[PDB]
Design a protein around this ligand. Structure first.
Ligand code: CA
Ligand code: CA
Ligand code: CA
Ligand code: CA
Ligand code: CA
Ligand code: CA
Ligand code: CA
Ligand code: CA
Ligand code: CA
Ligand code: CA
Ligand code: CA
Ligand code: CA
Ligand code: CA
Ligand code: CA
Ligand code: CA
Ligand code: CA
Ligand code: CA
Ligand code: CA
Ligand code: CA
Ligand code: CA
Ligand code: CA
Ligand code: CA
Length: 1025
């Protein structure tokens, strides 16, 4: 049932956006309602709608294909049928008086004989052939000759009609009048164009013929809005929309003896069950003919063997499916067989194919069942739900072509062996799909090549540690062996090996040149064949990509035999890390490519050079030999040097050399090259500026297990600090040079500037870590403004710690996105602490002023964090928290508190006077007033204590105080409150008489009228309600 509003959309898209005339809307509506009532099926109604678009559209698809060899693309069609840009187009003004027929004729003549796209080709193809032949051959290509006769239209009566003399005379006159042709050749040529226009019309109106059937399917595809093929430079109808009406004949086996013979065509043979009794049975003989022949053998019972007297012949594909095990051998009885496919679900397989036959053994829910296959041309094993089951290929007979195993396991019980022997190329692809809190350990793989085996690939799922939401995987050992691995003379064929994760892996091949690594590895041991001949080509290419290793890549051959002299490592698309590289015969080492290669530790004593050419860079964690030359490229290369004897160059990009000894040797130099390069001093003191042996460095970092003592900063533009052996000092530090601390050092870090003597000295300290960093003590004698950045490198919040010793700093400014608890002891010149710019949920800043200048103005600013800001008893502190749960502490003097947004706590730890007291500017609902530290005698109220003290129209502040303290606070301190002159006050009475005594009784001012009626005392803690 189509609604009439669906048929109009189907017509619109067929007409490429032209909406139907009023008349036709009525026609479609009829087709809709005839489907609501079941007087017409669905597909019937939609066909008729698309038949209405014949003249507009079908005229452009069919003619373009016949003349230019391809149907116009959808974008193209838009232009010919319905467009803004072509003023005159098929469904527009110019053509509105041309019938269906004369539309096809028009298009034909345009594309064929003019400057049209087909002129040159059609002119050469149909020159010097007669009218009769023109028509007969064209009728064959369009309408089929066989097809037409079967459809029952008589071909000969039709072709004669089109070529009769009357007909040709009509067109001659037609073409002569209409087209601008006057030459006698061009008229003859245009007449043929008009005829094969006429034939296209006659085809598309009857629905017989190949052109009509294909074009119909393309308009149906164009119906729903989008064209599936839509190639940009045209779609060849016949390719994209296949007919293939012939499908040969379909033959059924019985529980008897069958004698079945195919059509020499696309025929298919069914060998199912009858009452649960097999239909491939004794004496059955099957015969195929031509090459589209299929036998489908399906049985509840286990396949066992071919039954007595059975002969299958001339059949190309055999499909065997069993409810139980399969055991068959097809090296005889079956002849002509190109493809064998065997299918189990939950039982064993034991299959042997003849060479020349492509085997495919698919097994679901393999469990403890074993797959074993042999022989065949290309073999494919596809095993899922695996568990204990061995997979084993070519144990008895190798494949002619490629092996391609793949094995999936969901279990926690471990994936059972996989062994392959032989094949041109081998791939074994394991996966692990176990649950989120389990560990599956994967399958041990063995591949043993025959003398055709050029390549081997062994992929697994990446290892991981079993977590809360991390699926755990351990990797299987892999063992790859070439035929000629044990031979003294025979060549060896395995050239390339690809791994994608692995446990304890081995290769052994004298023909090996390339290893491709990937994912998570334990160890690779490379041996070459025991060839006695001294090898001449000794280049290991080692392409890495996302590789990480527990342990060692070793050249097992190098030790007692002839290893690789040159190793090339090409890092690609992802970072790689090789825990250890052991290559005892290696001479050159070239690290190349695309993404970082890190070698944590190499053992390659005979190395004469290392050469990075890689874009991102290379890092080597092992200290180079004192004799060993190193050359960097662009990108952050990074090494360790000792008392080097050679000229080390680092190339462009931001490089990093760590030195274990302060002066080099022999001679014996290291140039950082272009870019900002770090020099790391793992030593007891340095003076790199002095030594011309070092050049091109910009940053000095003191970090390492031997890093310590006095270091000449001169000539460096930045400073860094890491973990250290002991107290470290930077001397001769230029102006605008900042220190970044990257890890906890040992002992006091002293910075002494080049010239500290001025009174506007600025230093930039940075703290930069992923985790909480205990920066320790840094001393900044003679600096007036100290800027601290506390930087978190990851998304998860932390709080850094620092003792600053800056005895002439007036300003401390804190920026960043992590918290800073700052020890401030003895920093007494500080009058401005500004942590206001700081940023996280909890980048918590702690500060306590060490200022003792009587009557000072000190300004303390918090950040977004839950900050803890304490003033000085000496000082008139202005304290301001930012966002978040700030604690502001009162110590003495005239203080001004502003906890911004959030549940702030105003912690009152001093009594004050009657003049020097704390004013809280913005006390609001949620803020607390901690009076624990003024409970001189006992501990406050504890109730909700909340009726304001009220006095007269002209009572003085002095009077309101005295009134509030009237009671006896000698044994037990009491809270009261009042509102005077537009501000709110709180009192603690700790005294006898009705005098508020300045000394021991306490007042706290709160800007504005804030009603504490309903607000309650926690312990001694008043929460504003
Ligand atoms: Ca349009
Ligand atoms: Ca138009
Ligand atoms: Ca479509
Ligand atoms: Ca039978
Ligand atoms: Ca056949
Ligand atoms: Ca055949
Ligand atoms: Ca060997
Ligand atoms: Ca040897
Ligand atoms: Ca050796
Ligand atoms: Ca470099
Ligand atoms: Ca550089
Ligand atoms: Ca440089
Ligand atoms: Ca220098
Ligand atoms: Ca962090
Ligand atoms: Ca100074
Ligand atoms: Ca200072
Ligand atoms: Ca104070
Ligand atoms: Ca804050
Ligand atoms: Ca706050
Ligand atoms: Ca607040
Ligand atoms: Ca307190
Ligand atoms: Ca009193």
């Amino acid at each position: 049932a189509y609604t009439t509003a669906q048929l109009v959309t189907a017509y619109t898209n067929a007409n490429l956006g032209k909406a139907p005339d009023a008349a036709t809307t009525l026609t479609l509506d009829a087709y809709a309602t005839q489907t609501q009532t079941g007087g017409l099926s669905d597909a019937a109604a939609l066909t008729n709608t698309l038949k209405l678009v014949n003249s507009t559209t079908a005229v452009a698809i069919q003619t373009y294909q016949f003349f230019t060899g391809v149907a116009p693309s959808a974008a193209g069609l838009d232009f010919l049928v319905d467009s803004t840009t072509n003023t005159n187009d098929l469904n527009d003004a110019y053509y509105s008086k041309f019938a269906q027929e004369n539309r096809f004729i028009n298009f034909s003549i345009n594309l064929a004989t003019g400057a049209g796209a087909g002129a040159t080709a059609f002119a050469a193809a149909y020159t010097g052939v007669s009218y009769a032949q023109t028509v007969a051959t064209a009728y064959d290509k369009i309408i089929g000759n066989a097809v037409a006769t079967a459809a029952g239209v008589d071909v000969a009566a039709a072709v004669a009609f089109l070529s009769r003399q009357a007909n040709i005379d009509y067109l001659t006159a037609f073409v002569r009048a209409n087209t601008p042709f006057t030459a006698a050749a061009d008229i003859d040529l245009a007449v043929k164009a008009a005829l094969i226009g006429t034939i296209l019309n006659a085809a598309t109106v009857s629905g017989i013929g190949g052109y009509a059937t294909a074009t119909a399917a393309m308009i149906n595809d164009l119906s729903d809005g989008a064209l599936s093929t839509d190639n940009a430079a045209g779609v060849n109808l016949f390719t994209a929309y296949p007919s293939s009406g012939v499908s040969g004949s379909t033959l059924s086996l019985t529980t008897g003896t069958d004698t079945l013979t195919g059509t020499a065509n696309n025929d298919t043979f069914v060998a199912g069950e009858v009452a649960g009794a097999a239909t491939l049975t004794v004496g059955d003989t099957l015969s195929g003919g031509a090459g589209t022949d299929v036998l489908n053998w399906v049985q509840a019972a286990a396949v066992t063997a071919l039954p007595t007297g059975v002969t299958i012949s001339g059949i190309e594909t055999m499909n065997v499916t069993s409810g139980a095990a399969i055991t068959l051998n097809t090296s005889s009885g079956v002849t002509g067989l190109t493809a064998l496919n065997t299918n189990t679900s939950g039982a064993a397989q034991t299959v042997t194919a003849g060479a020349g036959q492509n085997l495919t053994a698919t097994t679901a829910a393999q469990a403890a069942n074993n797959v074993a296959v042999d022989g065949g041309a290309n073999v494919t094993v596809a095993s899922t739900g695996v568990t204990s089951g061995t997979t084993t290929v070519g144990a008895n007979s190798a494949a002619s072509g490629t092996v391609s195993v793949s094995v999936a396991n969901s279990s926690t019980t471990t994936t059972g062996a996989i062994a392959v022997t032989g094949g041109t190329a081998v791939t074994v692809a394991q996966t692990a799909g176990n649950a989120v809190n389990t560990t599956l350990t994967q399958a041990d793989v063995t591949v043993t090549g025959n003398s055709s085996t050029t390549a081997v690939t062994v992929t697994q799922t990446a290892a991981a540690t079993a977590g809360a939401t991390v699926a755990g995987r351990v990797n299987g050992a892999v063992t790859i062996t070439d035929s000629a691995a044990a031979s003294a003379t025979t060549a060896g064929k395995i050239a390339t090996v690809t791994l994608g994760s692995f446990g304890a892996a081995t290769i052994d091949s004298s023909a090996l040149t390339t290893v491709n690594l990937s994912g998570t590895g334990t160890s690779l041991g490379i041996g070459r064949g025991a060839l006695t001949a001294t090898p001449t080509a000794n280049t290991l290419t080692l392409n890495v990509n996302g590789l990480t290793t527990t342990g060692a890549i070793t050249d097992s051959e190098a030790a007692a035999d002839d290893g690789f002299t040159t190793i090339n490592i090409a890092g690609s698309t992802a970072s790689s890390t090789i825990a250890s590289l052991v290559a005892a015969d290696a001479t050159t080492l070239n690290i190349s490519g695309d993404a970082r290669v890190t070698i944590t530790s190499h053992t390659a004593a005979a190395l004469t050079g290392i050469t990075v050419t890689n874009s991102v860079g290379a890092t080597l964690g092992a200290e180079l030999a004192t004799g060993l030359v190193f050359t960097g490229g662009a990108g952050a290369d990074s090494i360790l040097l000792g008392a080097t004897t050679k000229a080390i160059v680092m190339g462009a990009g931001d490089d990093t050399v760590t030195v274990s000894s302060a002066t080099l040797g022999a001679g014996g130099s290291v140039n950082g090259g272009d870019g900002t390069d770090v020099l790391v001093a793992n030593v007891n003191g340095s003076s790199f500026s002095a030594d011309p042996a070092f050049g091109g460095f910009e940053t000095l970092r003191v970090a390492g297990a031997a890093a310590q003592g006095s270091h000449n900063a001169n000539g460096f533009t930045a400073l860094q600090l890491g973990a250290t052996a002991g107290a470290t000092t930077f001397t001769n530090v230029a102006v605008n040079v900042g220190l970044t601390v990257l890890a906890a050092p040992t002992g006091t870090t002293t910075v002494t500037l080049a010239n500290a003597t001025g009174t506007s000295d600025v230093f930039n300290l940075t703290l930069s870590s992923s985790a909480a960093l205990a920066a320790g003590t840094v001393a900044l004698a003679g600096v007036e403004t100290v800027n601290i950045a506390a930087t978190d490198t990851n998304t998860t919040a932390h709080v850094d710690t620092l003792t600053l010793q800056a005895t002439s700093a007036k300003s401390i400014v804190v920026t960043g996105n992590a918290g800073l608890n700052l020890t401030n002891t003895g920093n007494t010149a500080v009058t401005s602490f500004d942590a206001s710019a700081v940023t996280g949920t909890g980048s918590a800043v702690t500060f306590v002023s060490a200022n003792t200048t009587v009557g000072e103005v000190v300004t303390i600013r918090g950040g977004a964090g839950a900050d803890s800001l304490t003033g000085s008893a000496t000082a008139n502190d202005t304290i301001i928290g930012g966002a978040g749960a700030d604690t502001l502490v009162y110590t003495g003097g005239t203080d001004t508190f502003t906890g911004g947004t959030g549940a702030d706590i105003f912690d009152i730890n001093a009594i004050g006077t009657s003049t020097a007291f704390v004013t809280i500017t913005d006390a609001a609902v949620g803020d607390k007033l901690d009076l624990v530290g003024i409970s001189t005698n006992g501990a406050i109220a504890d109730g909700a204590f909340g009726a304001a003290v009220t006095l007269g129209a002209a009572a003085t502040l002095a009077q309101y105080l005295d009134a509030a303290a009237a009671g006896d606070g000698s044994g037990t301190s009491v809270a009261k409150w009042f509102q005077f002159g537009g501000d709110t006050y709180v009192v603690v009475d700790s005294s006898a008489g009705a005098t508020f005594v300045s000394g021991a009784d306490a007042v706290i001012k709160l800007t504005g009228l804030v009603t504490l009626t309903t607000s309650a005392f926690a312990t001694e803690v008043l929460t504003l309600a």
